[PDB]
């Protein structure tokens, strides 16, 4: 029931298996064992996470799985298919966020002018 | 139990055999066939979770497909040198305005 | 065809960027002119 | 092909906003000299 947790920032993608957190989790991607191999530290096993440095869209994108070691590998029934375009210093913006900053900018300016206007009248 | 998402030219489709048990996410548009579902254009970034069941090849094996698309379309890059200039100059210009108002009032 | 899309947009954006930068430089030269008269007259 | 046009269109708004702020101070400072 619990959906996968995915976070992207810059050129980093982080996933954590939400299925059963009571044991360490080994990860297989498109029927290949990854994580914990202690080499190519671009990908690195974590107690309940997995980090992908320098994410590439063409490869490194398919069916990701999670399963606790000791249980037999592919009995897991949680497959995630994701396809993402990741670029450095990229962000998603819309019409509402830009207008919020515009209105906030006039508020700080307009408040400051009126404050000194009334404060200088003390004399 | 891989459930092969068939990505069209400008569309996302899901292929299975047994009737889907909807969970959440994008509702999508159904075509003429049951279990073949359209999820809209790639530009909209479809997301959600859909279920299924067995087939003729594999019998009574539950699965779970979670769709996650991040093809940023209204995508905006950032230049730290440019954003620094706008904020720095805005701070200076506000002080000059406040100084001008003070000259009249004081 | 799809030749219009974003290419036509970026040509006009560059024009305005350098046009409005020039008008911002014209304000600094006036500010230097006025701030000398204010400083001298008000001592 | 790209989206780098979006930041350029966002920066143009900042330049237009700053022009109004500089117009105010020039108008404001000329008045003090005239209303001596």
């Amino acid at each position: 029931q619990t959906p996968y947790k995915v976070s992207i920032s810059g050129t980093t993608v982080i996933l954590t298996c939400p299925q059963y957190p009571g044991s360490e989790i080994l990860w297989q991607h498109n029927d290949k064992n990854i994580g914990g191999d202690e080499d190519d530290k671009n990908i690195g096993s974590d107690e309940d996470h997995l980090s992908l440095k320098e994410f590439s869209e063409l490869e490194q994108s398919g069916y990701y799985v999670c399963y606790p070691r000791g249980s037999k590998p592919e009995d897991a029934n949680f497959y995630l298919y994701l396809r993402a375009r990741v670029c450095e210093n990229c962000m998603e913006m819309d019409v509402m966020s830009v207008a919020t900053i515009v209105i906030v900018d006039i508020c700080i300016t307009g408040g400051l002018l009126l404050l000194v206007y009334y404060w200088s009248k003390n004399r | 139990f891989k459930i092969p998402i068939e990505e069209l030219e400008d569309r996302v489709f899901v292929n299975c055999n047994t009737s889907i048990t909807w969970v959440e996410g994008t509702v999508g548009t159904l075509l003429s066939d049951i279990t073949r579902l359209d999820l809209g254009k790639r530009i909209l970034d479809p997301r959600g979770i859909y279920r299924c069941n067995g087939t003729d090849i594999y019998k009574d094996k539950e699965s779970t497909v979670q769709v996650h698309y991040r093809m940023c379309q209204s995508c905006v890059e950032l230049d730290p040198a440019t954003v620094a200039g706008i904020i720095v100059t805005d701070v200076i210009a506000t002080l000059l305005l406040a100084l001008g108002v003070f000259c009249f009032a004081g | 065809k799809d030749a219009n899309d974003t290419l036509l947009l970026q040509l006009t954006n560059t024009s305005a960027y350098y046009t409005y930068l020039l008008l911002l430089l014209k304000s600094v030269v006036y500010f230097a002119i006025i701030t000398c008269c204010l400083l001298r007259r008000t001592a | 092909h790209t989206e780098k046009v979006n930041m350029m269109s966002l920066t143009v708004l900042g330049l237009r906003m700053l022009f109004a702020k500089t117009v105010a101070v020039n108008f404001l400072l000329t008045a003090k000299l005239f209303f001596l």
């Binding site: 819309d94 207008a99 515009v102 006039i106 | 209204s74 | - | 979006n6 269109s9 237009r16």
Partner: peptide, 29 residues
């Protein structure tokens, strides 16, 4: 892209000033 018609934000947000100064001039004269 986001939307090309966001330059209308700056325009009307200073047009508020132009309407107000028309009222104050008409009030006194």
């Amino acid at each position: 892209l986001l939307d090309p018609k966001l330059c209308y934000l700056l325009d009307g947000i200073l047009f508020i000033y132009g309407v107000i100064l028309t009222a104050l001039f008409l009030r006194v004269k």
